[PDB]
Amino acid sequence: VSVITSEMKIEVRMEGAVNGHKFVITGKGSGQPFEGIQNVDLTVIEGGPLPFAFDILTTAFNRVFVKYPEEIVDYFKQSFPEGYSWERSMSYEDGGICLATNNITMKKDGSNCFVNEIRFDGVNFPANGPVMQRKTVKWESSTEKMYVRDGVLKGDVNMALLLQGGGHYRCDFRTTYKAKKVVQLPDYHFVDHLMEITSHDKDYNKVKLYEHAKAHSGLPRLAK
Amino acid sequence: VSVITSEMKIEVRMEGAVNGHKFVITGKGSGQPFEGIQNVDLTVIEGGPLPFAFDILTTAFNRVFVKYPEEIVDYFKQSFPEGYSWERSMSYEDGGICLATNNITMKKDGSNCFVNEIRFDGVNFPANGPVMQRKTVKWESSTEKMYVRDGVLKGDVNMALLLQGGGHYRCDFRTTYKAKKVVQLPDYHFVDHLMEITSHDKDYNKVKLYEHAKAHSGLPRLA
Ligand SMILES: [Mg+2]
Ligand SMILES: [Mg+2]
Numbered sequence: 001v002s003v004i005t006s007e008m009k010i011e012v013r014m015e016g017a018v019n020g021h022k023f024v025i026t027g028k029g030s031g032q033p034f035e036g037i038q039n040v041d042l043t044v045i046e047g048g049p050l051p052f053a054f055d056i057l058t059t060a061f062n063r064v065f066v067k068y069p070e071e072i073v074d075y076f077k078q079s080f081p082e083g084y085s086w087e088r089s090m091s092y093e094d095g096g097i098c099l100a101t102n103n104i105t106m107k108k109d110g111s112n113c114f115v116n117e118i119r120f121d122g123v124n125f126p127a128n129g130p131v132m133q134r135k136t137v138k139w140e141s142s143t144e145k146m147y148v149r150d151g152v153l154k155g156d157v158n159m160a161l162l163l164q165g166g167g168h169y170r171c172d173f174r175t176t177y178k179a180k181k182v183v184q185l186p187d188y189h190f191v192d193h194l195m196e197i198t199s200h201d202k203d204y205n206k207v208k209l210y211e212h213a214k215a216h217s218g219l220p221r222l223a224k
Numbered sequence: 225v226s227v228i229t230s231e232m233k234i235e236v237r238m239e240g241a242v243n244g245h246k247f248v249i250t251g252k253g254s255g256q257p258f259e260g261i262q263n264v265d266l267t268v269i270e271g272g273p274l275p276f277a278f279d280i281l282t283t284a285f286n287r288v289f290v291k292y293p294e295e296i297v298d299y300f301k302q303s304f305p306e307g308y309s310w311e312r313s314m315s316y317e318d319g320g321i322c323l324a325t326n327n328i329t330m331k332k333d334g335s336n337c338f339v340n341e342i343r344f345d346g347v348n349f350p351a352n353g354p355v356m357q358r359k360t361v362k363w364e365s366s367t368e369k370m371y372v373r374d375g376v377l378k379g380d381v382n383m384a385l386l387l388q389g390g391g392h393y394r395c396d397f398r399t400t401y402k403a404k405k406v407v408q409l410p411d412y413h414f415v416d417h418l419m420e421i422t423s424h425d426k427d428y429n430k431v432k433l434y435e436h437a438k439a440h441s442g443l444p445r446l447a
């Protein structure tokens with residue numbers, strides 16, 4: 001039995017460091033779990049102005065916000081109210097790498113709100129690279145490949161940041177999702193993602209995010 | 225001009241998380257910079273008993289402790305008293321990965337002591353793997369390859385943990401060393417490392433480490 005409802009709130013707190021630069025970001029938002037859409041408004045409360053591209057942080061601020069078709073098992077919505085956590089490695093093509101974790105739970109009170117405890121760390125970003133030089137434009141849309149491994153769920157996705165001077169900067173995501181209770185495990189499937197920073201101030205001390213995600217079984221064998 | 229001396233003290237503080245498990249470790253030690261040897265006594269003050277193999281943490285608690293021959297430029301000893309910092313990725317063959325940083329400086333009280341601020345984070349270690357199951361025995365010795373890149377120093381090394389059931393568990397280290405002031409840059413070279421946990425209690429809440437390291441230019445061309 002799922003306790004998820006059409007309109008739920010979001011609360012997040014991220015603490016971390018990139019190339020040794022510490023920072024803390026908090027935020028609030030809301031999402032529609034069944035429609036696979038969400039909004040998050042963030043504020044850098046420590047470490048601002050950030051010396052690195054804010055884009056590397058955006059995907060770390062909840063797969064519960066994915067429109068899952070009836071035919072595919074939804075690992076995430078089943079996990080609440082207890083929730084789940086995730087671990088992720090993000091390996092960039094120039095050697096830069098980031099690791100992040102998120103522990104997600106629902107508030108005891110019937111406020112229908114998700115709480116996110118996030119840790120984010122990145123190292124080895126070249127001084128002349130697009131991340132430290134803040135030359136990124138946006139993340140392209142993507143399709144995450146979901147598969148079960150040793151009783152938990154894994155998600156791998158080829159990501160790419162469009163750069164100011166044109167061209168792309170690739171990053172490989174490897175995520176492990178762990179429900180806090182026994183839930184039904186899904187067969188191999190996919191999750192399409194589309195996101196964007198809908199608003200931000202000069203130094204990205206204030207940032208608004210939007211994400212739309214939908215699960216599917218891939219291209220059908222027959223054309224048309 | 226180098227301000228390094230034959231006997232120097234070490235103070236370390238590591239805070240981090242592995243697979244979401246938070247922990248804090250502090251310690252004190254001493255080393256002989258010119259001989260390339262050091263000892264560090266560690267104590268887990270938060271998060272114990274650690275659910276993961278302590279071995280993954282050991283190399284994160286200072287390349288200043290390396291015997292450098294006169295012929296090779298010493299990037300590390302030159303950097304003090306200001307010091308330097310390093311960033312490192314440790315990629316294991318089963319997907320587990322750790323990132324660590326260390327900001328190193330000398331106290332300005334003339335006590336010949338290095339202070340180390342360390343952050344350590346690891347994720348994606350399989351529940352049935354040797355790290356979460358604590359099936360590691362020790363790190364094998366190694367040879368780090370040092371090379372300059374964009375004005376700073378990089379160090380890459382093929383590491384391996386011997387496992388209890390026999391066999392090895394490989395990890396690739398990628399480190400970037402950044403001096404806090406302008407220092408002479410070295411040509412491509414190598415640093416041999418030999419380390420060992422000389423003592424530890426049952427759950428590794430108390431651990432003693434020893435490391436020996438020496439820089440060199442590789443095998444001579446002539447036999
Ligand atoms: Mg922008
Ligand atoms: Mg042992």
Ligand code: NA
Nearest residue numbers: 072073186187
């Ligand atoms: Na399914």
Ligand code: NA
Nearest residue numbers: 296297410411
């Ligand atoms: Na040299």
